[PDB]
Write a protein that binds this ligand. Sequence first.
Ligand code: NHW
Ligand code: CL
Ligand code: MG
Length: 385
Amino acid sequence: MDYKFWYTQPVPKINDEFNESVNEPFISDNKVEDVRKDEYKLPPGYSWYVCDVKDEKDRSEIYTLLTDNYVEDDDNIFRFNYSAEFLLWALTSPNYLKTWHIGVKYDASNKLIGFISAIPTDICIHKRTIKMAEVNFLCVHKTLRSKRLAPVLIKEITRRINLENIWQAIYTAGVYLPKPVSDARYYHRSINVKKLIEIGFSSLNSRLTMSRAIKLYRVEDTLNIKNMRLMKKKDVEGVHKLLGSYLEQFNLYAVFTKEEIAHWFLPIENVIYTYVNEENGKIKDMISFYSLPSQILGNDKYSTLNAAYSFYNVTTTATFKQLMQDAILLAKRNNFDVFNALEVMQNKSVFEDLKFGEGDGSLKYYLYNWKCASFAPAHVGIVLL
Ligand SMILES: CCCCCCCCCCCCCC(=O)CSCCNC(=O)CCNC(=O)[C@H](O)C(C)(C)COP(=O)(O)OP(=O)(O)OC[C@H]1O[C@@H](n2cnc3c(N)ncnc32)[C@H](O)[C@@H]1OP(=O)(O)O
Ligand SMILES: [Cl-]
Ligand SMILES: [Mg+2]
């Protein structure tokens, strides 16, 4: 469209296109001393609020905000419903800054009507590793849309990130903004076929009857990798080597420390599931997926769609297809109705044989203040929450 806000930012214009040989900031030589020390101005009657995600009640307010006002599907049927424990995990990774968890209250009601967050992560883009912020959970109450609050939230979190001498960010969105480094479609694998049908997530046809669909998606309750088990603390060193080594082949990925691997992969029920295969004290395969339910809007039978989202999967003792089949089984065993994945890393290679269906959106990946060539999503090696 016009991108009146985005055009003022150090991000590519719609028709910018860079060679593989360009891989650098739009704006370099930035100085912490020059960063604005004043908070951005909000409309009258609204105030900044620093959220303490560790405090159950502040976390609860964020939770209510996103539950009522966060991302809905292309047809307004489902609304994503990140749990409060999920937020706690997502926002308190190693070395996180409380002051990057930013709310906006309406002064008269004392209610949170806006939120944006970031966490620090080292990102390797085209072989250069840069300290970045990973921005997520941008949300404006539905009653306050199209009033230019989001640019205020964006400019304010940028200011706070810059105060820590960080000048790049990574973020994703389902909407097209200037200008994606990569673009990955959603694919879905039906587990609880009948419920997906009944809530309008999937459909049948005259050559696919209900029973024939249920048979189509039926899975054998037996693992290809028989020793796949929930990750424990003892496996942190092993997962660090297995996943770290794997990721280096990609054009975009997080560079995890051991403390980050423990955070991101140690299991938390109804948040993060990590399974590992250990063989001679070495971790040789891993599977992981996170829990992101959607509230089902106005349905008398079901309130919640239980979805698993593929996170990081690595095999050295089986095929990729066999490892993903085990992923679908582990998600079934943990009561999920559907397993979702993006066409990143090696994932697209197994979607046809494992009976994934193409979804409606795509997820665009973005860098702030970074000029580089775009690339196919098989070359993406990071999955944001
Ligand atoms: C060095 C550090 C740098 C740190 C920061 C890096 C950048 C981080 C950027 C953030 C990444 C977050 C990633 C993320 O959390 C995950 S992607 C999901 C974002 N959240 C949702 O979609 C939830 C439901 N929607 C809303 O709450 C509102 O519709 C939001 C708040 C989305 C926009 O509220 P609104 O009431 O509809 O809109 P106005 O206030 O009037 O604002 C219009 C301006 O906002 C631009 N816009 C719209 N959606 C966007 C989006 N998803 N990213 C970036 N920009 C987006 C839009 O293009 C326009 O600018 P333009 O006029 O130039 O087009
Ligand atoms: Cl400004
Ligand atoms: Mg607004």
